[PDB]
Amino acid sequence: SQSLDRLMNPLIDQYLYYLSKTINGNQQTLKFSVAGPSNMAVQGRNYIPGPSYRQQRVSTTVTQAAASEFAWPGASSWALNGRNSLMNPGPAMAS
Amino acid sequence: DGVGSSSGNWHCDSQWLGDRVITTSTRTWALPTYNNHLYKQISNSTSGGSSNDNAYFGYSTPWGYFDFNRFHCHFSPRDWQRLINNNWGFRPKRLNFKLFNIQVKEVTDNNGVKTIANNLTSTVQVFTDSDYQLPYVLGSAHEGCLPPFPADVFMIPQYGYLTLNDGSQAVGRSSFYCLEYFPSQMLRTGNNFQFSYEFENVPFHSSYAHSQSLDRLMNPLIDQYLYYLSKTINGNQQTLKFSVAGPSNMAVQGRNYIPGPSYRQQRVSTTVTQAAASEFAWPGASSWALNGRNSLMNPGPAMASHKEGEDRFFPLSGSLIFGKQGTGRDNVDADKVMITNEEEIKTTNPVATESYGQVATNHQSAQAQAQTGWVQNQGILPGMVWQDRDVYLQGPIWAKIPHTDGNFHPSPLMGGFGMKHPPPQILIKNTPVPADPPTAFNKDKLNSFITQYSTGQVSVEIEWELQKENSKRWNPEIQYTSNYYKSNNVEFAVNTEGVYSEPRPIGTRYLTRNL
Amino acid sequence: SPLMGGFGMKHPPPQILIKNTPVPADPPTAFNKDKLNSFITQYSTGQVSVEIEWELQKENSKRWNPEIQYTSNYYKSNNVEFAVNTEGVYSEPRPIGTRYLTRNL
Incomplete structure (x- = not known):
């Protein structure tokens, strides 16, 4: 019922700072700001999402065009002793 | 007990036994009424947010909470100095928490003037989430913890939580939690609250810096019994030549273990009078994506902040920044701001702003030259060794390991001890006291309450286990020390206006041990 | 021995420190991380009692003639020495030592 990137308190700022600005408007002027509810994407986090092995995206919607036959050519695979095996179903990832 | 009898004493001291140190800290707190006793749905729409990456949905509660998840809440600077200069490791063992000397006040405003008086019959409600049934917000580096200076009086932060969101909207899987649906103790001015907690077994934190590097573990006087490919061409005929790997060429010697994982960060320099190509704070930052939302990789995997002699550089978001x-x-x-650095782990961990290494990308032949590619991100491999991020006096202590099917090395990335069952959240709220109701029945919930706030003392005692050092090193070690040179103010003391300040972050890795 | 007079001790009577516990005023309804600087104006009062047992060294002199003794003067005065004035002000009119009796060297 919670997402890994939304585990913080939405009412309280962190006691950590993030780099918010690099240029003043090519002199380098470093600026730092408190990571808080208004910018949750830059808050420090203790844990990160699990591993991935990217898969090609296929749509089930009717009336769609495809560049070419990519079922085998566009598939993710792993090789063992010169033999290619389809990565199926592969690591547990959000569909 | 009674109105005129104290429900607890002021306990604030540190006791140093042989293998254990017991820290006790007491603070005075103030608790106002939050949200006017209401629960409120909050989102990026209510706060005016627009970006997808910062969209959220959640609730703000009228409850406050006690947070002591920072080391300076328990260790004085001198105690921290002793711990870091005399021990190779430490870890929390058990916890004792107390609330006492409850004082509830009522505030009345006549015309531009407020009068404060005691409300001896009012109550304050406190309970602990011992079953971890509520969202855990102590695992984030939030403000509102007990002050490092014992004399400072602090305000209890308001408790809020987030659930699943789609933009500014919720989904059916989103959960709403009512904290009044939990049994809680109600305390008048004569009552007190206390509970004990036992820390689950965690590894000792590495309060040492390695005196050897992972690539220099061999005997510098003896050759290996292994050979390496030393030459390919004779001066395009292929003539393979092999040589013994020895002290003269340490880079090519066979090794049993390799440095830990990496996730490269952009390099930023603190030197003044420097030019930048463009604004790269967000565009040039390393990040990970979850359900279409991009989150900054901060602080990310434990990596060396900079190479030797390059203290001016720091990773864009790979280091803790204190104000x-x-x-x-x-x-x-x-x-x-105070930029922390992890240069002590350069002996085992890769540099944050450098590639992990190079890997072959083709098959060399008489027609194709051998090609290599930079490894900007490298996952866990067998034989890898690494050091976790160091903890700091003002840094976090623990975090809750997310309840998931799988995890790897669940040490909190911001530093500290990862636990499936961390110290429970302690939630506190002033019981609403309705004003005079109408003389005719009305079914609507009351919205007129007496303005109230509460104050009291809070004490937390934590027993820490120590790992003593048994080094045979002959020369003296590096130790944290204050500077004798004259200054207008004493470091880690109050100013002429009574303001306490922490002038620098203090790590734990000064003693050394072999790798 | 303290140069201003008295008994020198490595472990004298300990310092007794007392302070009124701060009582914060009404805090804001929105969280602020700064330490509170608004407090209810307070002061405290009470009674303090200290009891000290003193050991005495009695005199065993064989001196025949009477000794010098500290004594008040009978002669009339507007006020009694070591007493209050007409405005209730207590005063100590002179310093009093301890060395009036005599003994051989």
């Missing part, structure tokens, strides 16, 4: 006393909230200069 100096009095520092503003938005767009402060570099001299207003």
